[model samples]
Target: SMEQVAMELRLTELTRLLRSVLDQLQDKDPARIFAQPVSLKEVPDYLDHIKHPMDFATMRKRLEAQGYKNLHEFEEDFDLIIDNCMKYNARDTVFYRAAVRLRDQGGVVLRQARREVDSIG
Candidate 1:
């Protein structure tokens, strides 16, 4: 069923979009954006180690200080990362799906954190 496949693809795309948005919110450092500390599975031949989550926060603040407001600017950079991810392992559907899910979940977490920050201010 093409429709079914399309639906799956849409779900995947939505996941990707949510991920892109969340990644933008989470990390401002281009160098350490996708880097995670530990690998859940086998490491690839050329992949680098993961970056710390806290590093991402620092990057975000730096970007904000530089006057990059709104998620749109971040989206542009996120898309490039997605492109790289796709290139790195196009056949790894599990990896892609997991990345999407993790990112979407991160968005939810970040939203709550933002609310808490607002409350303090």
Candidate 2:
């Protein structure tokens, strides 16, 4: 059904987006945030190599250090940082691919671990 498709896509977008944000910051703290499994198959990926969960707390600490009033405020400030940083050099394509990979990283932790967490931080 169209409705099911719509619902699924929305969830997919949310998952993809939040994961991308975490990757951009290279967060890997258990205290704050933990990313989903990413790849679902029985064994996961060649690179999985028993990597520990990515942390969510790192982002919270960063946002707290800056200011925590609004999401857009953070994103706007984020763009400034990117705009300046991108001037010198880039693995822009690498990063884009990385985010997509993060999104594609399937889910075990995502549905189970820390389910009640808030604000999509």
Best by lDDT: 1
**Every candidate's lDDT:** 0.46, 0.40
C-alpha RMSD of candidate 2:
16.6
Model 2 per-residue lDDT tens digits across residues 48-117: 4433322234344555453334334434433333332233225566433444343344233333322422
Candidate 2 yields a Cα-based lDDT of 0.40
Score every model by TM-score: 0.33, 0.26
Worst 10 residues of 2 by lDDT: 29-38
Residue lDDT tens for model 1, 70-95: 33454444444444454554555754
Q: How well does candidate 2 score on lDDT at residue 85?
A: 26
Cand. 1 TM to true fold: 0.33
